[PDB]
Amino acid sequence: MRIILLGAPGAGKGTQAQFIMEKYGIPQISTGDMLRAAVKSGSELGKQAKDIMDAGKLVTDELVIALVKERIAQEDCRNGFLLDGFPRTIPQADAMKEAGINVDYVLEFDVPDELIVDRIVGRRVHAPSGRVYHVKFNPPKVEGKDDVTGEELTTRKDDQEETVRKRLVEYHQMTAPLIGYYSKEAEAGNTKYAKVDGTKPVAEVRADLEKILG
Numbered sequence: 001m002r003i004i005l006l007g008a009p010g011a012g013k014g015t016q017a018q019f020i021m022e023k024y025g026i027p028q029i030s031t032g033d034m035l036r037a038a039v040k041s042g043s044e045l046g047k048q049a050k051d052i053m054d055a056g057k058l059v060t061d062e063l064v065i066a067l068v069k070e071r072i073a074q075e076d077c078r079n080g081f082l083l084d085g086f087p088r089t090i091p092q093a094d095a096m097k098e099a100g101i102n103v104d105y106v107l108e109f110d111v112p113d114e115l116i117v118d119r120i121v122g123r124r125v126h127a128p129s130g131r132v133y134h135v136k137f138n139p140p141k142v143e144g145k146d147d148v149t150g151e152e153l154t155t156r157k158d159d160q161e162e163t164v165r166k167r168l169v170e171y172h173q174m175t176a177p178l179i180g181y182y183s184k185e186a187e188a189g190n191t192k193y194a195k196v197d198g199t200k201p202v203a204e205v206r207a208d209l210e211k212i213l214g
């Protein structure tokens with residue numbers, strides 16, 4: 001199974017990606033996680049992203065297409081994969097088309113803009129895994145600790161309110177057009193498309209996605 005998650009920043013995509021990875025046995029491919037890891041490690045492919053992410057802007061198409069091509073070539077993607085944060089522009093989606101990378105589901109997470117800041121400012125992450133929590137809305141079992149490893153959670157450098165506002169503007173200009181892009185693909189029979197209400201509690205969104213993925 002191959003799945004794309006679409007939605008504004010803070011819509012819940014990374015939260016739900018974890019459940020889909022676990023239940024369907026496919027890896028999550030998160031360009032944000034890969035970029036943050038490349039900055040942290042000083043990796044030649046991606047360390048360049050540091051100041052751009054800090055600005056709330058998208059990284060160039062060529063850099064993330066290369067990160068995704070490298071990641072998806074790996075053995076763990078043989079049986080499918082979930083794309084979380086990619087594609088993020090029409091040229092990224094067209095690069096997938098040109099590579100012959102068909103997908104089975106495109107899942108759009110709908111959340112009103114007015115909920116985004118208060119979600120992201122409360123976000124806490126386990127950087128090695130990508131697991132995400134929220135200090136009020138979805139807290140870890142033990143404060144500041146990853147439920148799975150017990151390691152100390154961190155706060156992303158790009159999650160302050162003003163940076164979130166900039167990322168939401170960028171999303172609306174550059175990334176929202178992918179809704180129509182994939183709706184058109186679905187009408188051609190090349191994927192399924194489904195929209196979920198991302199305002200429901202975490203477990204209810206998970207159940208709605210299970211109804212769709214079968």
Ligand SMILES: Nc1ncnc2c1ncn2[C@@H]1O[C@H](COP(=O)(O)OP(=O)(O)O)[C@@H](O)[C@H]1O
Binds near residue numbers: 119120123124137199
């Ligand atoms: N259904 C939900 N209700 C309330 N908060 C949520 C929900 N889903 C995720 N969150 C929290 O909102 C923040 C954003 O979610 P995240 O999954 O990181 O979004 P995305 O990957 O779409 O940017 C995180 O702190 C997360 O714990």
Ligand SMILES: Nc1ncnc2c1ncn2[C@@H]1O[C@H](COP(=O)(O)OP(=O)(O)O)[C@@H](O)[C@H]1O
Binds near residue numbers: 010033058092
């Ligand atoms: N596919 C992509 N194309 C361009 N930039 C990206 C891409 N994926 C991630 N980024 C960069 O990483 C940042 C964080 O993205 P992400 O981790 O997906 O956060 P959020 O879930 O809050 O949108 C973006 O603001 C952008 O700088």
Ligand code: NA
Binds near residue numbers: 189190191192
């Ligand atoms: Na398909």
